[PDB]
């Protein structure tokens, strides 16, 4: 399990550090990702197992990622109401590609005085029990090495769950009712044999050429509602 800690209510301009712990994180590389209330996932940046740092361009000067021994930290440098969000830490899975196999459930930060586009199917999409639904994911520029694209399932208050990585590889332990397809700029998630418990928001997530823009991006999410 990953666990995020340290979220609280702060006034604008008050530095705040969140922590990411496991129950051995020292071998793990970790990204920070946030989600404003009712909105989609947004990548902040990434720290390597030995401290190498990568940032989303929008996050520069707003977030500082560090680590030591048992913990990976995120300092929110000078917060504003723009930063009210749940913050997640996520471990990169096996290999060389940027996708995440484990998430925490998030920590909530509230701030108060008191060019990549990934377009998914519009929310909501309706599906009947026992049926089959397909979800689209189109990226404005191609994902790295053609196939570096993952899919996650997110339910309220729960860690996002990896379903598919490398466009079509089923994550460990996930139902084969989920199929990923596509390449380059165009991808699909197919849910076969729909069940009540498949009601969730689904996110695609690309790795991208770090010299062409940010190293990672997310689609806007597609909520599936089950009849």
């Amino acid at each position: 399990q990953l666990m995020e800690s340290g979220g609280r209510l702060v006034t604008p301009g008050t530095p705040l550090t969140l922590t990411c712990t496991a129950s051995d994180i020292s071998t793990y590389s970790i990204s920070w990702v946030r989600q404003a209330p009712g909105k989609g996932l947004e990548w902040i940046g990434h720290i390597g197992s030995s401290g190498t740092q990568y940032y989303a361009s929008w996050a520069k000067g707003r977030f500082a990622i560090s680590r030591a021994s048992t913990t990976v930290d995120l300092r929110i440098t000078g917060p504003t109401t723009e930063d009210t969000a749940t913050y997640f830490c996520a471990r990169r899975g096996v290999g060389y590609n940027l996708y995440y196999n484990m998430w925490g459930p998030g920590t909530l930060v509230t701030v108060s005085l008191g060019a990549i586009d990934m377009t998914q199917t519009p929310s909501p999409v309706s599906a009947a029990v026992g049926g089959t639904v397909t979800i689209n994911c189109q990226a404005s520029q191609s994902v790295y090495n053609s196939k570096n694209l993952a899919w996650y399932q997110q339910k309220p208050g729960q860690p996002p769950k990896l379903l598919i990585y490398d466009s079509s590889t089923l994550a460990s332990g996930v139902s084969s009712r989920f199929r990923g397809s596509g390449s380059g700029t165009q991808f699909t998630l197919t849910i076969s044999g729909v069940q009540s418990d498949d009601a969730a928001t689904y996110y695609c997530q690309g790795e991208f050429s770090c010299s062409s823009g940010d190293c990672a991006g997310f689609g806007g999410g597609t909520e599936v509602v089950v009849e």
Binding site: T27, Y28, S29, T52, R91, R92, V94, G95, Y96, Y144
Partner: peptide
């Protein structure tokens, strides 16, 4: 085909 990983190897 040349491969150009953008990240270090991850065992986890």
């Amino acid at each position: 085909r040349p491969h150009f990983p953008q990240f270090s190897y991850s065992a986890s």
